[PDB]
Amino acid sequence: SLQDAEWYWGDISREEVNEKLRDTADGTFLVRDASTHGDYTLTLRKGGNNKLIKIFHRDGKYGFSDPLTFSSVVELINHYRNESLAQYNPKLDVKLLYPVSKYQQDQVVKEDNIEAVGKKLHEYNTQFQEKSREYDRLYEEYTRTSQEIQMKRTAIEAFNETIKIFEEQCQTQERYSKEYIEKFKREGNEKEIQRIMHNYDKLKSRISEIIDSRRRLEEDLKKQAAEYREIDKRMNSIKPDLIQLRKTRDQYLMWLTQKGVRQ
Amino acid sequence: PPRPSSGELWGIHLMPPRILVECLLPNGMIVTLECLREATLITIKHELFKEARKYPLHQLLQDESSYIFVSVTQEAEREEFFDETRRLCDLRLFQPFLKVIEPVGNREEKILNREIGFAIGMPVCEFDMVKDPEVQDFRRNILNVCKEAVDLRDLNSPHSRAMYVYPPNVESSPELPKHIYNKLDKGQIIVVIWVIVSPNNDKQKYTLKINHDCVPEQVIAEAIKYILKVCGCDEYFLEKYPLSQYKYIRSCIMLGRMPNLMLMAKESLYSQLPMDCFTMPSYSRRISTKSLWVINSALRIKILCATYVNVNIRDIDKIYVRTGIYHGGEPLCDNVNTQRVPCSNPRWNEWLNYDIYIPDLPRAARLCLSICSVKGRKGAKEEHCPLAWGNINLFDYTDTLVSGKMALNLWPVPHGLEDLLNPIGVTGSNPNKETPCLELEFDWFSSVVKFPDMSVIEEHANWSLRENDKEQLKAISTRDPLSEITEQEKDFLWSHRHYCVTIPEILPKLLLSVKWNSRDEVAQMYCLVKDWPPIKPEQAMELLDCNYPDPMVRGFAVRCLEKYLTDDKLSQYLIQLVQVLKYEQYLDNLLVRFLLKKALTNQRIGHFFFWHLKSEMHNKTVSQRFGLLLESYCRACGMYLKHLNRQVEAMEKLINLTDILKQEKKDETQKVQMKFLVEQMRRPDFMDALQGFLSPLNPAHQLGNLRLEECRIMSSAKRPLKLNWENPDIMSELLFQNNEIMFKNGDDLRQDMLTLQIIRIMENIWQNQGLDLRMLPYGCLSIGDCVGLIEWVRNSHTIMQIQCNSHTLHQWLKDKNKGEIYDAAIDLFTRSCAGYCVATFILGIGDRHNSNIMVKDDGQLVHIDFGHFLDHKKKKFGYKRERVPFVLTQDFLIVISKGAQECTKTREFERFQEMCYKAYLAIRQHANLFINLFSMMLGSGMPELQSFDDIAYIRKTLALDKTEQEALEYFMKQMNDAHHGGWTTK
Numbered sequence A: 001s002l003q004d005a006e007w008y009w010g011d012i013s014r015e016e017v018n019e020k021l022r023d024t025a026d027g028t029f030l031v032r033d034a035s036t037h038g039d040y041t042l043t044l045r046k047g048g049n050n051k052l053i054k055i056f057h058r059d060g061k062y063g064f065s066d067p068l069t070f071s072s073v074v075e076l077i078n079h080y081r082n083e084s085l086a087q088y089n090p091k092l093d094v095k096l097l098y099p100v101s102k103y104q105q106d107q108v109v110k111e112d113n114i115e116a117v118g119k120k121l122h123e124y125n126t127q128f129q130e131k132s133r134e135y136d137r138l139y140e141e142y143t144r145t146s147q148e149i150q151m152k153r154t155a156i157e158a159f160n161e162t163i164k165i166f167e168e169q170c171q172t173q174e175r176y177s178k179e180y181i182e183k184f185k186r187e188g189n190e191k192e193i194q195r196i197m198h199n200y201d202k203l204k205s206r207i208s209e210i211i212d213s214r215r216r217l218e219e220d221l222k223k224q225a226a227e228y229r230e231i232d233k234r235m236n237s238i239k240p241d242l243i244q245l246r247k248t249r250d251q252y253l254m255w256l257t258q259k260g261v262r263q
Numbered sequence B: 001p002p003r004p005s006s007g008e009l010w011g012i013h014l015m016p017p018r019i020l021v022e023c024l025l026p027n028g029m030i031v032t033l034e035c036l037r038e039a040t041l042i043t044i045k046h047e048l049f050k051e052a053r054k055y056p057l058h059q060l061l062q063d064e065s066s067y068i069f070v071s072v073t074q075e076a077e078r079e080e081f082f083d084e085t086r087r088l089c090d091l092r093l094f095q096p097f098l099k100v101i102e103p104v105g106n107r108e109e110k111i112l113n114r115e116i117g118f119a120i121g122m123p124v125c126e127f128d129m130v131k132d133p134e135v136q137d138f139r140r141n142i143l144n145v146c147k148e149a150v151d152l153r154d155l156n157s158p159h160s161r162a163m164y165v166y167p168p169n170v171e172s173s174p175e176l177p178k179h180i181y182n183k184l185d186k187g188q189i190i191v192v193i194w195v196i197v198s199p200n201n202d203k204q205k206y207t208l209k210i211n212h213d214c215v216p217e218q219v220i221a222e223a224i225k226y227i228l229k230v231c232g233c234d235e236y237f238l239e240k241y242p243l244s245q246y247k248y249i250r251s252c253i254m255l256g257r258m259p260n261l262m263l264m265a266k267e268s269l270y271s272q273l274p275m276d277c278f279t280m281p282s283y284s285r286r287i288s289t290k291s292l293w294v295i296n297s298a299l300r301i302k303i304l305c306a307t308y309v310n311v312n313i314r315d316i317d318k319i320y321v322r323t324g325i326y327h328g329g330e331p332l333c334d335n336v337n338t339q340r341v342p343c344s345n346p347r348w349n350e351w352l353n354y355d356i357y358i359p360d361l362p363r364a365a366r367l368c369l370s371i372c373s374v375k376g377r378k379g380a381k382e383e384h385c386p387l388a389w390g391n392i393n394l395f396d397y398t399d400t401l402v403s404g405k406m407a408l409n410l411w412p413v414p415h416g417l418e419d420l421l422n423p424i425g426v427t428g429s430n431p432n433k434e435t436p437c438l439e440l441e442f443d444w445f446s447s448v449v450k451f452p453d454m455s456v457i458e459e460h461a462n463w464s465l466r467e468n469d470k471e472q473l474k475a476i477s478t479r480d481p482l483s484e485i486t487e488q489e490k491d492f493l494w495s496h497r498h499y500c501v502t503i504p505e506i507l508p509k510l511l512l513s514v515k516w517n518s519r520d521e522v523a524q525m526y527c528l529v530k531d532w533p534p535i536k537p538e539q540a541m542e543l544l545d546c547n548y549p550d551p552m553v554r555g556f557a558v559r560c561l562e563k564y565l566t567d568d569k570l571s572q573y574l575i576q577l578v579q580v581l582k583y584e585q586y587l588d589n590l591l592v593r594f595l596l597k598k599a600l601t602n603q604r605i606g607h608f609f610f611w612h613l614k615s616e617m618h619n620k621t622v623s624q625r626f627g628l629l630l631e632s633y634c635r636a637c638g639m640y641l642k643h644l645n646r647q648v649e650a651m652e653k654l655i656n657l658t659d660i661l662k663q664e665k666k667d668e669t670q671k672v673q674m675k676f677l678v679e680q681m682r683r684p685d686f687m688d689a690l691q692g693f694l695s696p697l698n699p700a701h702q703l704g705n706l707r708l709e710e711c712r713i714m715s716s717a718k719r720p721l722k723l724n725w726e727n728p729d730i731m732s733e734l735l736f737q738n739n740e741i742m743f744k745n746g747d748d749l750r751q752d753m754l755t756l757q758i759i760r761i762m763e764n765i766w767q768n769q770g771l772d773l774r775m776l777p778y779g780c781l782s783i784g785d786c787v788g789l790i791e792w793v794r795n796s797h798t799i800m801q802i803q804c805n806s807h808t809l810h811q812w813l814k815d816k817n818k819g820e821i822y823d824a825a826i827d828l829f830t831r832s833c834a835g836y837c838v839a840t841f842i843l844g845i846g847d848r849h850n851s852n853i854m855v856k857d858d859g860q861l862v863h864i865d866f867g868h869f870l871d872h873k874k875k876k877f878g879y880k881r882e883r884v885p886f887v888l889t890q891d892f893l894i895v896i897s898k899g900a901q902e903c904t905k906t907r908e909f910e911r912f913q914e915m916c917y918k919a920y921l922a923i924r925q926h927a928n929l930f931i932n933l934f935s936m937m938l939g940s941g942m943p944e945l946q947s948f949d950d951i952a953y954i955r956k957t958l959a960l961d962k963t964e965q966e967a968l969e970y971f972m973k974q975m976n977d978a979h980h981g982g983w984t985t986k
Ligand SMILES: C[C@@H]1COCCN1c1cc(N2CCOC[C@@H]2C)nc2[nH]c(-c3cc[nH]n3)nc12
Pocket: B714, B715, B716, B720, B742, B749, B752, B778, B780, B790, B791, B792, B793, B796, B864, B865, B866, B867
């Protein structure tokens, strides 16, 4: 027929086609009006790309090349739905096999009266904003958590390097100590051996304290590392639901404008 | 790693006045010492070695002058403090302890690498740990650009070194627009020159009227071995450009303001010039094959396994790995998925077979893969959500095809991204190894598979008009870079690819017709671009976007810029030129070498080159790339590194100061916060840092001493800071004596920084076309993660502040601009409404109101807080309408019509409409430039600017798919529907 076939989508934009053809198998096709009348543009999927094949028009005949043979766009689409495009241009060796039908546009409509559609559109629009606020909120905790984890990790890097310094201090003190505690052992200077020992205890204590500060920070890191993974999960669960929720909202809106008076 | 916070210690934003510091003496002793937070190391080292005598083994301690301090900084780096004049609070210590050590190694080489690490925001020694060969090769091989720059910099006497420090801020053409030349009388421009007296530095006014064509040396000779300078800042007329070409004079012409200039002896300037001495680093000191075309087989990659993914089993059903071969943004073949495995068992070992010939893989071929979650619980439609992504270059930087097993750490999905793959994303592995890891395996061809040479390319290349046809080719070149390109037109260009050389501008469209999946067509195209006449710079840039990845293509683009890109336009488009560096596959390319060469030969360029790179060092996807580029720049930028660190340390204290106000003191009243803020800004460490340094908004502006009275914490949410300085220039009474800036810590100013850049570019287009739509594009700069600076326009108040009646806005302008100056204020308010009304509609700026719009006593309109742009409201509410954000209200129309009722029926509103129509068409004429500018920003990270389908918004507000007669009728219709009638056609 005329403007009744399913692959004719009238005045859809290239973006509407790219989404209708995104991640589609080679051969998926559809036709729309000229972006720049009544000129037409067949859109075909080939090698993960969206190829635009203009449908020229001269004195009641349609075709891709100069010898416009076909007398109707329906006759052109149906022919190449069974014949390969390579006969026209060898570079495109595929056929119109997967038609994008208006079935998807009329899908999800559900209701038939403007009020029901509008009342239902208002329900979906409410749930969408409520899941967007929920998502945007969850995203900030996601970003905040990710940053504070990077900080804690760098801090633990600092704790290690610091502990290495204080441990170097110990082995340093052990080397000089013997050469002098043995000299006091014979020089009867017992109280000077106690002063050296006391400073060593002061140093071992700090090391034992600094290690516990790293232990508590490492414990906090485990707590935050998991809290990040739970946030990531909740986000990878809200993203797929939020998407189609937005699409369903847009469709109800598309249904409302078409059924309503247009300019 | 980079610093966690900006505090004086980990977990503390401010040291108390006194604090305890553990000192590790070289004899194993540990001495606890109480120090003033502001104490210097030379002092602490003194008191420490006085106290040490009270401890054992004090005999074997050498002289205190024989030691220095070392400690662990908040970057986990063990730093040696060779500058014992630094304060304890300025050390960025992790914990309060100091070790005493005898200095070793190259002391000079250590001091530089510490200064370089400070500006970078990361220890340079971390680059030494990088095992990646490409990294080290970049660090060594990039030095030749450095040397060649520092050589040209001192090729002559101080004059050459002067052109580097104070380049001429000149336009790209000395031709004066017809509306600018009218301001001159008989082609002459009156100028006043002041000369500081040799004794007592008195001012000698010497008004004179001279031709705009006359070179600075010619006006100098008037005076009835010397240099000129602008009073108030540090920009010098060091070249023989026409005085009109210099921006300061050209602006003064249109603004009617009389140019005030200062004459200098040129010896005080040459003497202050330092010795920009570059020294080779340490990594420069210490340091069978089969062609790709010979490999006969199809491409295949074994997806072995992955570690984990974060998603509860109760919501997501299965997971799979989606892969795909890409050349830029377009796939070289249909994407190939693996089998759907349960979330808890990421294992495939499934050799993915791609429908592509191995010999036909283009040079820039890449693999884009991601781990997706499938959720088929909602009917026939099963939702696919991406979990993590990653990209790889099939050829490494050495033309060597990949082979063997490989491990890859994947990145999180960028907010707002909905596609299953992210081919615009950066290549390589994620440095965060606490992320999912994907095991792959490329087959191996019993030899190192390499890409054929340029010689073999041309061999395979040589192996292979109607006037109306000529017109179709011409029109295809004129179309914008984002217009639809049908297959018929692709073959049309490909079949006439040789004739296209006469119309060089068509090359972008021509490259889109190439079957990059065909070694045959690719080889032939290499030969056409090799001998393709250079194109204009604004059009070459398009070749650097995510659509043109091939090296030969990008190389040609680079050589166009090297040949025809002025230092003015390079500073004008620097934002995008820095952004496009993310798209390059390898660290060492011609683009980066050209930019670095320009950064090292122009300080006005290198300054923003540095801050643009620094502002994204927090971003782990480009931190290594920009880190290595910053290391090379600082290693050779000469003495300006000292001034950059002065800027970095000043910002670090403002970040710390504002961090305390919004964290530790968030619940205290503003009367208490100001008390705390004034008390902190009076300390020695804070005044030494935030006084006497160059302004990051404009290194020509000298930020001197603070005016604490004018400083104030803004009574807002983000708690911004308004700061005031004194202009130390002797002639500070001319340009300005107070330089005010708003320090914002919390709001991402990148989108606002880009919007102000496009507004400048828009105003430049108008001035060249005789349209003084006097716009005030104040300065905005992002210097970190949600940290930035904004120039404070003096004497401006919001339209809501003015109203605290319809005529209220007009009666206010009647005051502060009463009398003979009235017609000037109205002319500015109108000319600014036109530029803003057109710029906001074209871009889709967030709605304006009495708070986003401001008016200066000048009558100048100043919009603020643009925020969103493009189709940002389409995702929230699915409306397919182009919005009119800036709707002139009755209050605004009364001002334009000089207070006349029936404002739509006045000659002033007629001229107002003319400016809008002329400005809208003017921009529409340059739509190729603006579509490329946004195209070069797709990998930036702004949520409202991700896919080319976001840029299509400006393709609609400019009605590009309509005729210029239909576009002006569309603009009128849009403006007339938003203003409720009034816009007429004449
Ligand atoms: C620096 C700019 C322009 O010069 C005048 C001052 N200016 C601003 C003033 C202002 N308010 C004044 C009133 O109290 C609240 C708030 C502090 N808010 C802003 N927000 C932005 C902005 C820019 C990008 N994004 N946002 N600029 C300004």
